[PDB]
């Protein structure tokens, strides 16, 4: 006869959902409080077994989005509240009219001709474009200045100061007032109190591995053909902890990605047309961003013992811009070719009819780009870069977009919400002095849209969280069950 037998130590596993310990290297303040210091081991062992992996329906992937947002919540909780400064601020009428906040324009608007010549300008580091801004024009000004009183800690007297916002940080009350002072509030101070970012968050890159607690292991699908929904991995490697991961948030692109590789693999979400593409580290797709004018920060005290970092600078430098550089056009075309041969995508194969275009405008969140570097965000039109990369007929909207250039204009917004999960509103302090940030592009956020058999689009998308699905897309978390029950003729006996 056959009897049940118990075996211990059998190497089996199953799906699992448990929290994870985080480990970090450059722990300015976040180490020993939420994450351990790093160990520094990356050896993995290959197994001759098959297991299913997903990049969207993964416990590790979902937790990573939560942990980053959760970490940010603790950072801003003790910081200062900017409720008091929601008061009318006298502002320069001649300066708000220029950027159209008030929309008070009369007469003027004289006719002028358009040269419509050349406009194939390109720039590389040796030229004088980088050093002095000064790059063909259209980089002129972006500033506004106002006043407010803001009685300080001594609740007996006031002290008038000056702070200079940007164009996209104020909403002004239109009216028939002839005074040179234009009453104008903040952007979102009548919706919810906004708290500063009086910390070093966003001032330095953040990296941290993920380590599963004992009794739980991580599996990785090493097959080069991985796409996202493939449940059969020829090569699978077990590990104790995951690789590093960049915690940078941006739109239309992903910078400083650790998963750059010589191959232009594509991660596809089979359930719909959601897509992310990883570029190649062979064309040196570096991009450099600069903003001119070296800045001064004058902390101001409010009635809580805390400090509000203002920018009383009266200088009027040119607006921020980025020139990308490197071999781009030859690099992009390889992405289109890869899409053709990839499984799924039962669409056209005409390489010069598949075109990379931005979504249909609407809200500024999806219309512009969004890149953060060393504490100051920048959003750029990106029309010219799209215009020059494909070399399309320059009949797009107004004459301002006619040019084909390797650089694009940008502006600064200071009242920014954390795009990560849903919402909120926070204030980013301004950095003293000049900023120059350099990065390497190593991913691409895009939704592939096509309804007919012709003219497929590689449409950009503004889902910042999608980046985290590229760093740990091939990782799976499995709980180990060392108990195995199998029959055996042997009996317990006595």
């Amino acid at each position: 006869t056959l009897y049940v037998t118990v075996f211990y130590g059998v190497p089996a596993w199953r799906n699992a959902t448990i929290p994870l310990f985080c480990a970090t290297k450059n722990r300015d303040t976040w180490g020993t409080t939420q994450c351990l210091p790093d160990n520094g081991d990356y050896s993995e062992v290959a197994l001759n077994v098959t297991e299913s992996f997903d990049a969207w329906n993964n416990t590790v992937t979902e937790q990573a989005i939560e942990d980053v947002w959760q970490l940010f919540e603790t950072s801003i909780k003790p910081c200062v509240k900017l409720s008091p400064l929601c008061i009318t601020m006298r502002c320069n009428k001649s300066e708000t009219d220029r950027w159209g906040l008030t929309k008070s324009i009369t007469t003027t608007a004289s006719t002028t001709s358009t040269t419509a010549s050349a406009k194939v300008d390109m720039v590389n580091e040796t030229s004088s474009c980088i050093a002095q801004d000064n790059c063909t024009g259209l980089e002129q000004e972006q500033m506004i200045s106002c006043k407010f009183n803001m009685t300080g800690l001594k609740r007996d007297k006031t002290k008038e100061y000056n702070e200079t916002w940007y164009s996209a940080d104020l909403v002004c009350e239109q009216g028939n007032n002839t005074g040179n002072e234009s009453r104008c509030y903040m952007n979102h101070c009548n919706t919810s109190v906004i708290q500063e970012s009086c910390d070093k968050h966003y001032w330095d890159a953040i990296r941290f591995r993920y380590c599963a607690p004992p009794g739980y292991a991580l599996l990785r699908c090493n097959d080069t053909n991985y796409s996202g929904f493939m449940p059969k991995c020829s090569k699978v490697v077990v590990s104790s902890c995951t690789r590093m991961m960049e915690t940078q948030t941006s739109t239309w692109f992903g910078f400083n990605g650790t998963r750059a590789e010589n191959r232009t693999y594509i991660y596809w979400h089979g359930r719909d047309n959601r897509t992310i593409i990883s570029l190649n580290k062979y064309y040196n797709l570096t991009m450099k961003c600069r903003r001119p004018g070296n800045k001064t920060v004058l902390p101001v005290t409010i009635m809580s013992g805390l400090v509000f970092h203002s920018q009383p600078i009266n200088d009027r430098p040119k607006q921020a811009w980025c020139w990308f550089g490197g071999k781009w056009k030859d690099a992009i075309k390889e992405v289109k070719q890869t899409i053709v041969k990839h499984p799924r995508y039962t669409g056209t194969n005409n390489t010069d009819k598949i075109n990379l275009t931005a979504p249909g405008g609407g809200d500024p969140e999806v219309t512009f780009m969004w890149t953060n570097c060393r504490g100051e965000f920048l959003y750029c039109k990106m029309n010219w870069f799209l215009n020059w990369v494909e070399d399309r007929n320059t009949a797009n909207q107004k004459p301002k977009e006619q040019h084909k250039r390797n650089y694009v204009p940008c502006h600064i917004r200071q009242i920014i919400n954390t795009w990560h999960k849903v919402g909120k509103n926070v204030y980013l302090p301004p950095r003293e002095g000049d900023l120059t940030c350099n990065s390497t592009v190593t991913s691409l956020i895009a939704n592939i849209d096509w309804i007919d058999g012709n003219q497929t689009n590689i449409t950009m998308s503004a889902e910042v969280a999608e980046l985290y699905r590229l760093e740990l897309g091939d990782y799976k978390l499995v709980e180990i069950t060392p108990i195995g029950l199998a029959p055996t003729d042997c009996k317990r006996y006595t």
């Binding site: 006869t1 056959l2 009897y3 049940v4 037998t5 118990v6 075996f7 211990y8 130590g9 059998v10 190497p11 089996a12 596993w13 448990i18 929290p19 994870l20 310990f21 985080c22 020993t32 409080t33 939420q34 994450c35 351990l36 210091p37 160990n39 081991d41 050896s43 993995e44 062992v45 197994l47 001759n48 077994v49 959760q70 380590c211 607690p213 004992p214 009794g215 292991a217 077990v238 590990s239 104790s240 180990i480 069950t481 060392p482 108990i483 195995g484 029950l485 199998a486 029959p487 055996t488 042997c490 009996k491 317990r492 006996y493």
Partner: protein
């Protein structure tokens, strides 16, 4: 590292078939042997650092060990038991079947087998006490 390979050495047998697979007792014990060491190391200087999973790491260990103590098979690679096997169609193929490939097939009736053997040990437990009391 040796611990990394050691902790990952248990799964090296996953590719082998059931008959040719070499069992690894003490694997969980060695897993927790260094886990606290890593957690303890540099600790001297919401639940991740706190006890949301640290107790779960303890909990996983006690459950598995208490599982054996409940069944009376602790510290033994194999323990023959008086309970008979259930429906016998799901016969393991000891030549060309991995442990995992077959654990899922029997997973359907795994819960029922758990209940059946628990009662059996109690009955055997009752017999042992009666014999001891007699003598």
């Amino acid at each position: 590292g040796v611990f990394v390979l050691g902790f990952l050495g248990f799964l090296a047998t996953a590719g082998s078939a059931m008959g040719a697979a070499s069992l690894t007792l003490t694997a969980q014990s060695r897993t927790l042997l260094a886990g606290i060491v890593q957690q303890q190391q540099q600790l001297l200087d919401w639940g991740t650092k706190n006890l949301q999973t640290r107790v779960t790491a303890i909990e996983k260990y006690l459950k598995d060990q208490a599982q054996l103590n409940a069944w009376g098979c602790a510290f033994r690679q194999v323990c023959c038991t008086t309970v008979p096997w259930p429906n016998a169609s799901l016969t393991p193929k000891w030549n060309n079947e991995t442990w995992q490939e077959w654990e899922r097939k029997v997973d359907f009736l795994e819960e029922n087998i758990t209940a059946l053997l628990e009662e059996a040990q109690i009955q055997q437990e009752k017999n042992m006490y009666e014999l001891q009391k007699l003598n």
